[PDB]
Symmetry: C3
Subunit: 335 residues, 3 copies
């Protein structure tokens, strides 16, 4: 191997969490090594018990977030165990050449492959499976998509000469799902992805999802699994959608600094209510919390958010600010 | 009450008009007082006589536009008369905390509540009802949404050191409506919002509206109710959509200065043909008219514009400019 | 005729190619003369033999790209031959007044008209037929749309003081098509546009296309008709959509410089994965190729791209760059 740089192995963590990393760094370029192991599996996606033939990187929807810096090289070992039923590959939107890597990574069950790409573009980017032809959309909407973040070596900035630093980062992957129904309107179950294919493709081509979820299921980022923050903390929220548009919004908050197209060579917009994630992309928003309590993080098609699955919660700790908002008079009879 | 600022009551006006206000101002912060009275009512929405179970702020779709300045406090008395049938509240996208105010403003029929929020973010913003769970999308698409504008104290600018001043402002609220049909394809009628709910929710979840209208009905901003201007006048057009994307366009004109994400801390884009309003947001465009006659203001999904209801007209007064455009030869036989 | 400028006739070429022109120019304003001849015709749109009642400018979908400079006047002779069956006109989004020209250009079969407009706004812009009322969307989605590019006299720039020059330009026109089906689900055929109208309008109002194509048919920009480039060449890709949103992406590449709203008075964004074309607009992206081989140019709703028709190919010549990407280990058994 001609490339004589130091190598470092990083262990991935399951979304919505993100592996430990530096923002600004004094390190120089290195080869950062990752492993992804594909898993086909049947999962429950809603409160009613609907099942779904999922196909995943590393067992999760979305796949895990990789974090590197500009000028690093990213060397991924992609594994397709013999217990899976079909061929898979990987396309990095961050990479240059060979259909994002897809033309160099097609592997049958029982095989693995090693792909390296140079991180020449900064931002958040989708990665997804793309075997060929009609298999491309089917693998993606079955769950085979995640993201990678390529940070500047000096960290993030506001476009006006000031550093932005986040106290924590979360990754919200949004998935449009297509579960067929029978003639009485009930959702269908299947014993393998291959058995689900014909009915699923027929539904896909009509363009209307049955479910729109964060982190793989209705309610995944609520209750015991709500996102957390403190008043005064700056939180970065990375949002991806590999196939279909979304319009994120933080109920009771704002996007203080937003890269809706997701690329750090562009200055952020400021003070947004709602932003726009193009299908086939990742974007990012940073917010400094000012008030404690519950927030909902939604797509602002509210039918999708409340009725099809696309709501997360934040539970924020701290002291209420009565200057920013206050209930002057509680509910009372009309005089 | 700890807050010792002067108070001023402002009377709202029905869309598409906007209450009188200053752009640049020499006044300091004040508490600006507004009242909204909720009205549930059955209305006619198209030329054919289709009826609709609407729920409104102040009797209109959209609710009226509130206009204040950065650093003001906005104190709203929300009234739910005893003649209404269910609970309602209000969520301001301009506000910080308590789900935009929604967690502090839930009122039953026969009750009123008073909410204050500080106007710390500049721009145009949606406000909407949001009672909880599946009621959130249903109240919004029934008509319970409007907007608020928070101006800089120095008025608007172009991002290049020049003031922009408008001669008039209009507010265009766009509403996606879901009217169910029976087995023969005819639109259904109902005697209350509660009776309409089950069939309406079933249709909502399929994501395709039956109607897309401006100012509450097909043709509302046409004919006797066309928008007006003169050649030489600078017109600001505020556009909101609380649930679903839109793509505004002025036929025969342009957006000279456009804030499509709607927030005045960002410089405007210039010289646009068509812009994009994310569902869950307000945006704004300014145009200086150069030619007299009729203009159509549309969403540029032309099926929605011409066939589902989403067309307004401007009738502009003044002298034709033959340098900008001219009919060199009138229709004639092909030689 | 009061206007005393030199006149020059330019011959149009069929998409995706573009007539020869200058970027930066030392010429002053002139009257640039074009001719468009309308053709209604029955065409095959997919691999299966589905037919479609198309209506076109100059025999192509999209209509051809016109290229002029800021301050030119554009004088178009629009011809409606006697072999056509209904009235047509033209609306230029680049023009000011009279519904873009539509109110001055309505012509019956057997007639022609001459319209001039001044090119006061820079960028890429849609042009389309717009006869009136429900005919507007129907003519547009039948194929009656193209684009015009208005270049600055000094050529394009990056917003940071540097010239951008392209080595070639392609025009990709995307068309949403609505082909009705019968009760068994098979696509319907018709003997005239008038006969197709009733069933087509019923389908249009449901908002879901049967086909989404580039250059008028599935596969039009693939195989013998793939787009071409060399490693090291800067390629400008103009994309239009007159009725419905799109999200372009170059698989294995990026948008180095992107004007997604399409207007050259705005600085471009840099280093994009996927961009957004609002329905009713044209946008533009420039990319310098770094790797040889096949690329797919798609809308990144991958169901639309792979299953409904919306994929083009580039075949790029040159030497592989193993620093940017390399296959470290070929597929092998899992140890
Ligand atoms: Cu796969
Ligand atoms: Cu992709
Ligand atoms: Cu309500
Ligand atoms: Cu909201
Ligand atoms: Cu026509
Ligand atoms: Cu148009």
């Amino acid at each position: 191997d001609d490339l004589k740089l130091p190598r470092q192995k990083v262990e991935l963590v399951a979304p919505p969490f993100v592996h430990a990393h530096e923002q600004a760094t004094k390190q120089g370029p290195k080869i950062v090594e990752f492993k992804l192991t594909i898993e086909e599996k049947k999962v429950v996606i809603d409160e009613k018990g609907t099942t779904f033939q999922a196909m995943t990187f590393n067992g999760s929807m979305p796949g895990p977030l990789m974090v590197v810096h500009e000028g690093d090289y990213v060397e991924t070992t992609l594994v397709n165990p013999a217990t899976n039923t079909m061929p898979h590959n990987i396309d990095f939107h961050s990479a240059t050449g060979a259909l994002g890597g897809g033309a160099l990574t097609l592997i049958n069950p029982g095989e693995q492959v090693v792909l390296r790409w140079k991180a020449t573009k900064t931002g958040v980017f989708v990665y997804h499976c793309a075997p060929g032809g009609p298999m491309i959309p089917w693998h993606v909407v079955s769950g085979m998509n995640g993201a990678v973040m390529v940070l500047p070596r000096d960290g993030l900035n506001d476009g006006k000469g000031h550093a932005l630093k986040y106290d924590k980062v979360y990754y919200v992957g949004e998935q449009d799902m297509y579960v067929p129904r029978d003639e009485k309107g009930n959702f269908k179950s299947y014993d393998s992805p291959g058995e689900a294919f014909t009915d699923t493709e027929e539904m896909m081509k009509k363009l209307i999802p049955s479910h729109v979820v964060f982190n793989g299921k209705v309610g995944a980022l609520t209750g015991k699994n709500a996102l957390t923050a403190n008043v005064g903390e700056n939180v970065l929220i990375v949002h991806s959608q590999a196939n279909r548009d979304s319009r994120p919004h933080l109920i009771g908050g704002h996007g203080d600094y937003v890269w809706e197209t997701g690329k750090f060579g562009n200055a952020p917009e400021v003070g947004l209510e709602t932003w726009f994630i193009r299908g086939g992309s990742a974007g990012a928003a940073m917010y400094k919390f000012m008030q404690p309590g519950i927030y909902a993080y939604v797509t602002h098609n509210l039918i999708e958010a409340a009725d099809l699955g696309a709501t997360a919660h934040f539970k924020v700790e701290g002291k209420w600010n009565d200057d920013l908002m206050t209930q002057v008079k509680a509910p009372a009879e009309i005089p």
